[model samples]
Target: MSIFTPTNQIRLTNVAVVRMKRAGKRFEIACYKNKVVGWRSGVEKDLDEVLQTHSVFVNVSKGQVAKKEDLISAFGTDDQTEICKQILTKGEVQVSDKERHTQLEQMFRDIATIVADKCVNPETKRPYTVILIERAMKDIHYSVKTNKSTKQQALEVIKQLKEKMKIERAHMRLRFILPVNEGKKLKEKLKPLIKVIESEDYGQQLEIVCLIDPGCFREIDELIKKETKGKGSLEVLNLKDVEEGDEKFE
Candidate 1:
């Protein structure tokens, strides 16, 4: 017998599966290796990579047949079919890599700002600077990855950074809009929660910025309200609020 050699291999782009579209009156082809393997419904718009891999492949031009079982075997999953379908749907609408990265960076930046605003050093009772937090992240070689969602990534990074930074207290900036009667009594009543870093008076409003363990915030808040009575309006300001010159408190 003479030795036989295959003269040509099917081109990848031409290898595909096609399906007849009854509603659209067209054959929808899922392609691979330059060949149409099988036909699918034309209503399936935006054929994702997952669905493309699962469909049968055939050499339409060469009249090559691909077994449906073989195609399923190559790309099938033991997981729920609906899950796979949803995954393909999601993949079709997923954002570009650049856009995803931008979102992740913005999320991490906000997380860094939150840490800088909410957490404080134990001994000094001072909140970390955003610059300091950034330096710490660089020191820890922290990086955000694509595999995790933004909220998950934020929680994880914030948790790790807090541990590394030794943040042990929660700092709050409070504005007590007191009646002229309660103004003088404020300082004397708040002495027990004495982590005050700065105190200032803007007309009738008393602004006090202090750091305390998170567990103690409720107690401290209650104390402030009780000491001033309902006549004093207490407002907690975000760290950014203070940094952006939102108030005359120094």
Candidate 2:
């Protein structure tokens, strides 16, 4: 597989080729060019190789600033404009390498949950283990960058694996708010029972959100109550929308 080709007409540094879906079309983008630029339609074989060669971890806030006009040109829609702004302003801004490393691990966990039970061997019709999916990712030189959503990153993996595997996408999400005082201790106990999605501090309180197996809610609830001594609360943020038995536990 050949690496991504650089332009003779322009300068590029630390450039990355990211494959993604937008407006129902898949694209292999030469991203972080101070703008979004590259192929809109192409063979997966070449795209995969381009990504393998050019995928990068950029410190977004430290990198080149994206102009509004450039963003519009790249995205070609108001929705995309807003999304670009949100990513530039809210999402990709990171302070330290430690935080970046933590975020990367969290992203990997999210990818595992999204890909684990949901994909299977095309010929065998048997589900791929989380470890196998993860191994295939490294084998193919797949990467997850900070610029894309966790879902988009997972799709990139699935795209590479499609010829080798089959997928049935399932969506499940949830969060929990932990009491400020007990948050640290509670996390130690709760970590084994739940997928710790992300934690945010809110002055006097902390919100420890997670993606959980819906069936495990009862167990998690009991753990929270016990750890908090009846003071810490587990608010199932989006329980009402869950259809029974959607998420499975391993």
Which candidate wins on TM-score? 1
Which digits, one per residue and each the tens of the lDDT, describe model 1 over residues 129-211? 77787778778888764333445555566677776776543434444444455655665555555444456656665545333
Candidate 1 displacement at residue 98 in angstroms: 2.7
Q: RMSDs, each prediction?
A: 15.8, 15.2
Worst 10 residues of 2 by lDDT: 36-45
Instruction: Please identify model 1 stretches exceeding 4 Å from their true place.
Output: 1-97, 149-155, 162-164, 168-250
**Tens digit per residue, CA lDDT, model 2, 1-250:** 1243455432345543333334443323233322331122111223333332232222322233334444445457434334433333333232346645665676676776667644445433444567776676667777766445666666677777675555545344556666776766666655676665666767777756554543324344455546563655565544433335645552
10 residues in a row with least lDDT, candidate 1: 33-42
Best by lDDT: 2
CA lDDT of each candidate? 0.46, 0.48
Off by over 4 Å in 2: 1-94, 163-250
Provide backbone clash counts, one per model.
Answer: 24, 0
